[PDB]
Every structure is written in C-alpha cells, then in structure tokens.
Amino acid sequence: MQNDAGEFVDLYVPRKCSASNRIIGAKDHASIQMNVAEVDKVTGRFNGQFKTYAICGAIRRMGESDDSILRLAKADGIVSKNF
Amino acid sequence: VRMNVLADALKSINNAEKRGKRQVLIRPCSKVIVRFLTVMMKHGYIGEFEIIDDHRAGKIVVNLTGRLNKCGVISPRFDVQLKDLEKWQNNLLPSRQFGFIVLTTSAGIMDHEEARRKHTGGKILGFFF
Amino acid sequence: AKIVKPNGEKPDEFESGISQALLELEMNSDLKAQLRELNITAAKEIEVGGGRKAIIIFVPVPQLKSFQKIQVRLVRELEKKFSGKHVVFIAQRRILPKPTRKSKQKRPRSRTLTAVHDAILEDLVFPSEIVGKRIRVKLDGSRLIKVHLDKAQQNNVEHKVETFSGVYKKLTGKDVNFEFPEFQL
Amino acid sequence: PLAKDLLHPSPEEEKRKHKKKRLVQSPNSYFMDVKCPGCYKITTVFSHAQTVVLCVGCSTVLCQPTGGKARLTEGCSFRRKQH
Amino acid sequence: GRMHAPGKGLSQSALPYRRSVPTWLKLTSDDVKEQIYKLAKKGLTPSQIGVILRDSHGVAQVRFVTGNKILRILKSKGLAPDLPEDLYHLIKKAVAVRKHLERNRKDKDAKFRLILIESRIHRLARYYKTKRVLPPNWKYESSTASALV
RNA sequence: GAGUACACCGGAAUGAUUUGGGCGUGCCCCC
RNA sequence: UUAAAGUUGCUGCAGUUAAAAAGCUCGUAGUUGGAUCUUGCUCGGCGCCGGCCCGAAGCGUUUACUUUGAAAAAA
Numbered sequence: 001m002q003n004d005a006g007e008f009v010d011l012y013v014p015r016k017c018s019a020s021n022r023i024i025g026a027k028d029h030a031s032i033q034m035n036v037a038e039v040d041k042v043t044g045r046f047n048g049q050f051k052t053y054a055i056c057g058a059i060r061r062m063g064e065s066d067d068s069i070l071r072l073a074k075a076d077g078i079v080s081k082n083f
Numbered sequence: 084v085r086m087n088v089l090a091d092a093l094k095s096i097n098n099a100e101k102r103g104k105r106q107v108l109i110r111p112c113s114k115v116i117v118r119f120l121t122v123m124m125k126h127g128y129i130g131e132f133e134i135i136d137d138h139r140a141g142k143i144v145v146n147l148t149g150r151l152n153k154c155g156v157i158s159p160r161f162d163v164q165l166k167d168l169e170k171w172q173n174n175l176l177p178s179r180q181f182g183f184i185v186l187t188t189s190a191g192i193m194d195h196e197e198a199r200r201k202h203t204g205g206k207i208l209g210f211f212f
Numbered sequence: 213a214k215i216v217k218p219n220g221e222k223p224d225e226f227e228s229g230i231s232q233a234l235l236e237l238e239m240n241s242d243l244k245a246q247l248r249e250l251n252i253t254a255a256k257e258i259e260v261g262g263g264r265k266a267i268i269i270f271v272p273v274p275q276l277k278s279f280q281k282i283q284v285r286l287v288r289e290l291e292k293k294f295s296g297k298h299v300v301f302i303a304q305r306r307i308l309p310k311p312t313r314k315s316k317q318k319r320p321r322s323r324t325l326t327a328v329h330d331a332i333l334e335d336l337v338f339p340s341e342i343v344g345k346r347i348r349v350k351l352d353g354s355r356l357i358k359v360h361l362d363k364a365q366q367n368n369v370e371h372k373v374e375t376f377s378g379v380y381k382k383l384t385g386k387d388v389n390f391e392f393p394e395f396q397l
Numbered sequence: 398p399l400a401k402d403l404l405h406p407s408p409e410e411e412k413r414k415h416k417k418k419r420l421v422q423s424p425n426s427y428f429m430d431v432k433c434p435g436c437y438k439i440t441t442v443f444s445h446a447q448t449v450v451l452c453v454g455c456s457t458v459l460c461q462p463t464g465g466k467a468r469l470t471e472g473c474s475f476r477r478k479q480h
Numbered sequence: 481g482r483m484h485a486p487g488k489g490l491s492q493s494a495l496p497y498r499r500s501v502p503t504w505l506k507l508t509s510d511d512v513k514e515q516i517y518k519l520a521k522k523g524l525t526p527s528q529i530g531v532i533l534r535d536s537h538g539v540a541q542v543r544f545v546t547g548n549k550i551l552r553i554l555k556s557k558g559l560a561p562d563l564p565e566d567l568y569h570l571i572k573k574a575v576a577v578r579k580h581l582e583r584n585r586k587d588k589d590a591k592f593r594l595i596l597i598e599s600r601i602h603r604l605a606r607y608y609k610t611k612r613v614l615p616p617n618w619k620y621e622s623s624t625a626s627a628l629v
Numbered sequence: 630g631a632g633u634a635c636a637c638c639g640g641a642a643u644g645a646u647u648u649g650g651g652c653g654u655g656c657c658c659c660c
Numbered sequence: 661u662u663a664a665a666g667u668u669g670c671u672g673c674a675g676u677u678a679a680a681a682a683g684c685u686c687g688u689a690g691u692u693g694g695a696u697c698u699u700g701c702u703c704g705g706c707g708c709c710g711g712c713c714c715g716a717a718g719c720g721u722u723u724a725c726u727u728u729g730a731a732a733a734a735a
Binding site for chain 4: 490492493494495496497498500502503504531532534535536537538
C-alpha cells in the first residue's frame with residue numbers, strides 16, 4: 001500500500017487465490033502452495049521449472065477444487081485442450 | 084410480483100459473488116442495468132459482460148472477476164443534494180479512500196466522484212465497493 | 213429514366229448507368245411481368261475495408277415484397293454484368309427526431325432509430341435470416357454485435373461477411389460480426 | 398460446478414430443460430404432413446391437434462384430440478417438416 | 481401465482497424467435513383473410529378462429545402473416561360483438577352458477593365461487609370502463625340474466 | 630385433365646432431336 | 661428533561677420456543693407498479709452593393725427532480 005510520499009509503508013502483502021481471486025488470511029491453514037513440474041520437449045524428463053498455484057480454504061471445504069486445477073492447467077498448457 | 088429489476092439483478096449478482104461463481108444470468112433487462120454495470124466496467128470492478136437480446140426483455144450474462152465485496156441498492160430512489168452527498172457516503176461507503184456510489188444525473192448515469200466536479204446531483208441508485 | 217426522387221434534383225451519372233443497366237437487363241430477358249412498376253430510389257458506392265468494392269441500392273418501402281420475391285436472379289445478373297463488386301438491397305426509411313421538451317403529430321415506432329437499424333440489418337442479408345443476436349461489450353466500452361445466421365444457404369454467403377460488415381459500418385457506424393451456429397439448428 | 402460456459406452450452410441440455418428456462422425460447426412442437434389412406438390428399442396438421450381434423454373431401458378423420466400430441470390415425474405417414 | 485387459487489402454475493405458449501412466414505405456407509393474405517371473414521360469419525370467438533386456422537390451415541401466427549391481429553380485423557369489418565368474449569364467458573359462468581344455485585340453498589362452496597366470479601367480472605368491468613371500450617354508465621346487476629347474456 | 634403409380638404442351642439442352650411421375654423440395658410410388 | 665436507549669428503531673428493533681401473524685378468504689380508499697422512443701415563422705444591425713448573416717414585437721406541448729440568481733428584521 002502506497003502513501004503520498006512514495007514508500008511501501010505496508011509491512012507485507014498476502015497471497016491471492018488463483019481460482020476465485022480471493023485473499024488468504026494468516027490463520028487460514030487450509031491453503032496449498034501447489035507445485036507442478038514440466039517435462040522436456042524432446043525426452044519428457046525433469047527440467048526444474050515450477051508453476052505455483054494457490055487455493056483458498058473455502059474452495060476445498062465447499063466441495064470442488066480439482067476442476068479449478070483443470071482450468072488452471074488448461075490456461076497454463078499442461079492439460080491438453082482436447083481433454 | 085417483480086417490482087424492481089435492478090434490485091433483483093443486483094441481489095442475484097451479489098449472491099453469485101458470495102457463492103464464488105464465474106458467470107451469471109440476469110432474467111430481465113433495462114437501460115439502467117446496462118449503465119450501472121458499465122460504470123462498474125469503467126471502474127474495473129467487473130470485466131466482460133454479455134447481453135442476450137431476443138424479441139422480448141433480454142438476458143445479461145456477466146463474466147465476473149474476484150475484485151468485488153458487495154453491491155447494494157437503495158429503494159426508494161431518494162433525493163440527493165450536493166450538500167447531502169458527503170452525508171450519504173460517510174455512513175454508506177466503508178471508507179472514503181475507495182468505494183463508489185452512483186446516482187441519476189440529468190446528464191447520464193454516473194458516480195459521485197465526477198458528480199462532485201460537475202456540480203450536479205439527482206436521485207440515487209446504489210453503491211458498490 | 214426510371215429512378216424517381218422525393219425531392220427535385222438530377223441523379224448522378226453512376227446511378228443513371230445502373231438504371232440503364234437494369235433497363236437493358238430487363239428488356240433482354242423474359243422478366244417483364246414484374247419490372248414495370250418496380251423502381252429503385254438511389255445507389256451509393258461503398259469502399260469495403262480491403263481491395264474490393266460494394267454497392268447498395270435504395271428501395272421504396274411499399275413495393276419491398278415484389279423485390280423480396282426475386283433477389284436470387286437479379287443479384288446473379290448484376291454480378292454477371294460486373295463480377296468485381298457485390299450487390300445488396302436495402303430499404304430507405306426516414307429517422308424522425310425525438311420529441312424533446314423544446315418541441316407535430318405523434319411519432320410512430322416504425323420510423324424510430326432502433327426499428328430502422330433492425331430493418332436494415334434484417335434486409336442486409338436475405339438468403340439466411342437471423343436466428344440470434346449477441347452484443348459484445350469489450351474493454352473500451354464500445355459495443356460490437358455478433359449475429360447468428362441460419363445454417364441453410366451458407367455457401368453463397370460465406371465470402372460476403374466482410375461486405376456486410378463494411379456496409380453496416382458505413383450505414384450506421386456500429387461494428388457487426390457474422391457467424392453460423394450449427395448445434396441449435 | 399462454480400465455473401460453467403453459459404455463452405454456448407451443449408444442445409442436449411438445451412433440449413433437456415424446459416422450453417421457457419432455455420437461453421432462448423424455442424417451442425417443442427412442429428407441423429405434421431400426413432396423407433389419408435382413403436382419399437389421397439395431403440394436408441398439414443399441428444403436433445398438438447387439440448380437436449378432430451378432417452382431410453379435404455370429408456372421407457376419414459386424421460387426428461384425435463388427446464392430452465398431449467396428436468392421435469395419428471393408422472395408415473398415415475408424416476415426415477420432418479422444417480422451414 | 482393465480483389471482484384466487486393458491487397454486488402457482490407455469491403452462492403457457494412460447495413463440496419462436498424468427499419473425500418470418502414459413503416457405504411451405506402458400507396462403508399469402510387475401511385468401512386467409514377470406515377464411516377469417518367466413519369463420520367470423522359462422523359466429524365463433526377469435527380464439528376459436530385462431531386455433532381452427534392453426535389446426536387445419538398450417539398457419540403459424542396471424543400477426544406474423546397479416547399486419548394486425550384477429551380482433552383488429554373484426555373491428556375493421558365491424559362484425560365483432562360489442563361485448564368482449566372473455567367477459568361474455570365470465571357472465572355465462574356467473575349465470576350458470578346462479579342457475580345451479582337458486583335451488584340448492586345449503587350449498588356454500590358454490591356461493592364462494594360465485595363471490596370470486598363477481599369479483600373477477602367487477603375488476604374486468606373496471607378495466608374496460610377505464611379503457612373506454614364499454615360505456616361508463618354500464619355496470620353489472622345481479623338480476624340481469626336475460627337482459628344481458 | 631383423376632394427381633398412389635398417368636395421357637400431354639410450350640419455353641430451354643443437344644437445320645433436326647429431346648428426357649416415368651408425386652407435392653410433403655426433399656424423400657415417396659414403378660422399373 | 662436530554663444522551664447513554666439500536667429499550668420507539670426514518671437511518672436503525674422485533675413477531676417458531678423469551679412479550680408477539682387477525683381462523684381463513686374476497687373487497688373500496690392509501691401504498692408499489694415489467695420491457696421498449698437518439699426548434700422554426702412580422703420588425704431593422706457589426707459588415708457589403710431589391711439581396712446573405714446577426715438582434716426580434718409575438719408564439720415556440722405538461723409536472724416532480726437537480727443547478728444558478730433575487731427578495732429574504734436585529735441579537
């Protein structure tokens with residue numbers, strides 16, 4: 001959060017959800033730092049690239065998050081478009 | 084029966100915002116709904132939206148974005164002066180640093196911020212933040 | 213020789229050439245039973261957004277149905293005389309202004325702006341009538357319309373969608389896109 | 398699901414829903430085209446006949462009124478009549 | 481829901497989106513106007529005319545083909561009755577309930593439905609007096625069974 | 630001219646010749 | 661007597677069990693009401709050779725709403 005003098009006087013910014021664009025509190029323990037890996041284009045082996053996703057707790061406890069993982073992966077390109 | 088299409092539509096999009104849905108369906112249509120959502124569109128609260136125009140009162144499909152807290156509507160349409168606008172947003176908006184309230188200016192449907200610098204006012208519609 | 217005008221002026225040489233072209237194209241063929249009283253009003257050359265050209269033809273309202281019977285032969289003949297230019301048919305309608313506070317009979321809704329634009333969009337495409345309409349509201353707030361067309365008679369109108377877009381952009385100023393749905397029809 | 402494609406749904410859920418609750422209204426009725434086995438004149442009958450209908454020449458009835466669709470007389474053939 | 485019954489209902493027609501006469505229909509204007517004229521000379525209500533034409537003539541909608549509706553045509557030719565057909569049917573229902581009820585004194589639900597029918601005809605008469613179709617001095621009397629039908 | 634399969638005529642395709650019908654324009658009768 | 665009283669609630673209260681919705685229905689006043697419609701016509705003034713523009717005697721469809729002015733005793 002910016003002031004008029006031009007400093008980041010806010011002490012920290014929290015993470016935002018990647019499925020509903022909601023905020024994650026400091027005491028919401030039902031969040032995930034999801035890590036998915038890619039493969040090489042010529043051999044399908046491990047490379048070292050990550051794509052981090054975050055899911056808030058209400059999306060878990062409300063009933064569906066795997067479909068949101070599919071939409072995130074199709075937007076990223078891991079899951080193919082034909083499905 | 085149905086007596087205010089704007090209140091019902093705005094309650095529906097509020098319920099779907101609380102429910103985490105991505106796209107909605109408003110059953111009736113009017114001009115004032117289109118102008119109210121395009122004020123939100125120009126203010127960046129809501130991204131894409133669509134209109135399904137048949138040969139009757141059409142339907143509106145809105146592509147929502149997770150930047151919305153709550154949208155409200157005031158019934159009946161109260162009279163707002165230029166000296167009463169700050170009195171309304173002091174006890175209606177959650178803060179003075181953000182949040183917008185719109186009203187029926189004689190020149191278009193438009194928010195209070197530009198209405199402060201155009202020296203005009205009229206009947207009220209609602210708020211969003 | 214055939215072209216009439218509501219007000220007194222001499223028509224352009226291009227419209228006169230179009231009138232003589234339709235006059236020779238009706239005297240050479242056997243079509244005489246339905247181009248005696250049938251008349252056009254005006255013609256305008258519209259540059260479509262590309263290397264091509266398009267034309268529009270003004271038709272009076274109370275004789276619209278007799279033209280509406282016989283487009284499929286006349287547009288083929290007018291393309292046979294000149295294949296580098298497409299021919300459409302529209303009907304001219306006068307748009308009355310709004311009865312505001314400073315202002316005369318009651319204005320009927322046949323001549324209002326929405327009805328004129330709806331009739332122009334409907335008569336722009338004859339051989340595949342509309343089945344649905346979508347209006348896109350993009351990032352800058354300007355509206356653009358997506359029109360759902362009929363599946364039947366799709367081959368002859370697949371290559372004319374840019375011509376229809378250019379004609380509707382010149383006539384009204386609103387961008388209109390065209391598409392063919394297949395699941396609901 | 399929280400995310401659904403309401404812009405263009407699949408047609409089977411369109412015919413699965415009610416005729417008023419669809420995205421665009423479309424009635425679930427059309428017109429027959431039957432020929433009487435007695436007199437060989439072909440006529441056009443609505444799907445829901447709602448009364449007794451007679452072919453031209455007044456030889457044999459074609460449809461009887463029911464609660465739903467037309468009660469087609471045996472020996473009459475219809476086909477897909479569309480515009 | 482309904483105006484007297486407590487039960488909600490959803491059963492009504494749904495017109496298609498396409499405002500176009502179908503190609504296979506060949507009755508253009510004059511002949512189909514002639515069957516509306518003949519069937520109005522037969523003496524039927526306009527709803528009966530519409531369902532008979534839709535049933536045995538293949539016409540989709542009259543207003544999609546002819547520029548006006550049925551009652552506009554019958555008022556243009558002037559052979560339409562002065563009393564509207566829905567109010568005429570409601571007056572017939574009221575006089576039928578009275579013609580059942582002069583003898584059964586102990587019936588009560590018939591009296592309740594009679595009260596509901598009188599409320600409906602009073603509301604419709606108020607609407608038609610507002611829309612000046614009927615004269616403003618006109619009103620319903622409970623004893624006019626043969627004077628008005 | 631009955632229109633379920635038929636008997637034809639004129640325009641038009643190849644100076645001369647000419648093609649099974651139906652009205653539900655797309656599948657129905659006789660091969 | 662005022663604030664505390666969001667315990668008179670217009671902002672801003674409650675009515676399953678704590679005080680609480682007439683037994684039910686019809687119905688006249690009052691309250692609330694679906695969508696749709698984007699200015700010109702007899703006098704003379706800043707200028708030019710009977711004439712173009714500008715200023716008009718006079719007319720230029722109704723309300724609420726909003727904005728600008730006047731008149732609005734002093735303490």
